Ligand binder design. Structure first.
Ligand SMILES: CC(C)CCC[C@@H](C)[C@H]1CC[C@H]2[C@@H]3CC=C4C[C@@H](OC(=O)CCC(=O)O)CC[C@]4(C)[C@H]3CC[C@]12C
Ligand SMILES: CCCCCCCCCCCCCCCC
Length: 128
């Protein structure tokens, strides 16, 4: 089926067809933008992503509840720093600019989802 599969040049046509195809210096806007575009900041945030998945991997059954409290506090810290970086990118870019990346919208959804998870865990008993 692989050998005989009909289509119903190629590279050249694709190249020809695909050949068709920030922020200024005003205020604290520029300060935040200069901070958040620095590759150190992105390396830091991917390191925090790595540490957060490390925290997600450390759950296990019948934890001493001193370990569970540590995991909950670490989740608080990580979601707080993710919210901080999301707000920093908001105040560096524009709102319309931030919401037009297709990744920062995903990050925004996950940050608010984790925040809502944190708030619900306090009063999750009454939902049912
Ligand atoms: C730098 C690279 C290696 C990434 C490392 C990721 C770790 C955060 C992951 C790797 C496998 C996980 C561990 C796999 C084995 C368990 C045993 C579990 O304890 C037990 O089941 C026995 C004790 C008991 O229950 O009575 C506690 C969590 C723990 C250490 C896990 C904690 C998180 C770990 C270390
Ligand atoms: C970075 C993570 C390094 C591994 C730590 C995993 C925690 C081990 C807890 C064992 C059971 C304690 C009770």
């Amino acid at each position: 089926i692989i050998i005989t599969f009909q289509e119903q040049k190629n590279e050249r046509a694709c190249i020809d067809f695909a050949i068709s195809a920030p922020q200024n210096r005003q205020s604290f806007q520029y300060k935040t933008w200069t901070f958040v575009v620095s590759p150190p900041f992105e390396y830091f945030i991917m390191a925090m992503i790595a540490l957060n998945t490390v925290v997600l991997m450390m759950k296990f059954y019948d934890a001493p509840y001193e370990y569970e409290l540590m995991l909950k506090c670490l989740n608080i810290v990580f979601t707080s720093m993710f919210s901080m970086e999301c707000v920093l990118k908001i105040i560096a870019f524009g709102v319309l600019n931030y919401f037009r990346d297709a990744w920062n919208v995903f990050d925004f959804v996950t940050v608010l989802g984790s925040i809502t998870d944190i708030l619900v865990t306090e009063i999750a008993e009454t939902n049912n």
